[PDB]
């Protein structure tokens, strides 16, 4: 689709068997999801954003379905105030910014 | 422009006669720029993102060019890690997300 930006670009995602709402964020390097369980090994990471850093758990090779589109990649889990789909998965669903 | 997301969507902006680099961010409500001098009065604002909140100065009716497109709107100034172009100005330049 073509999403206008008059409102936040929120979509429904499926991850780890759960439905969630998430923000399509071209200004995010990574995909960051609120606390949930995911399978496999993980490692701690610090990520930064507008107000400083948070600590997250990094899981690899996770499949997410994003507004109907499947993609695979790294997902970070931690105390983010909003679920965000960042560039690592936006590229996989072929998303572009156009003007 | 059609901007893919394999790299950060960094563009050149012009504000106050000066060229700066900024990130096009569909996950940002507002436009936030690093400390600089802007004309007129300002008002206080708090904005929040992944690592918490920061205090910024809100300037209205600022003339700004984004990747060559002219806009006039609100710019927040404060200790952001990166200059961010948010939806308030991405809608002025007619940007959409497409997949």
């Amino acid at each position: 689709p073509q999403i206008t930006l008059w409102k936040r670009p929120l979509v429904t995602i499926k991850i780890g068997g759960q439905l969630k709402e998430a923000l399509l964020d071209t200004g995010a390097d990574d995909t960051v999801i609120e606390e949930m369980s995911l399978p496999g090994r993980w490692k701690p990471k610090m990520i930064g954003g507008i107000g400083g850093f948070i600590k997250v758990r990094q899981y690899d090779q996770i499949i997410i379905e994003i507004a109907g589109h499947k993609a695979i990649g790294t997902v970070l889990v931690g105390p983010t105030p909003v679920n965000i789909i960042g560039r690592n998965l936006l590229t996989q669903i072929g998303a572009t910014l156009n003007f | 422009p059609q901007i893919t997301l394999w790299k950060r969507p960094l563009v050149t902006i012009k504000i106050g006669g000066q060229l700066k680099e900024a990130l096009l961010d569909t996950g940002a409500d507002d436009t936030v720029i690093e400390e600089m001098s802007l004309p007129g009065r300002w008002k206080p604002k708090m904005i929040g993102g992944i690592g918490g909140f920061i205090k910024v100065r809100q300037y209205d009716q600022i003339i700004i060019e984004i990747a060559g497109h002219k806009a006039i709107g609100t710019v927040l100034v404060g200790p952001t890690p990166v200059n961010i172009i948010g939806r308030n100005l991405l809608t002025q330049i007619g940007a959409t997300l497409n997949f």
């Binding site: 200004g27 995010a28 390097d29 930064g48 954003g49 | 961010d25 507002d30 929040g48």
Partner: peptide, 11 residues
């Protein structure tokens, strides 16, 4: 590491 910029105003 890795920087992630969602933002919203205020309260």
């Amino acid at each position: 590491v890795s920087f992630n910029x969602p933002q919203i105003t205020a309260a």
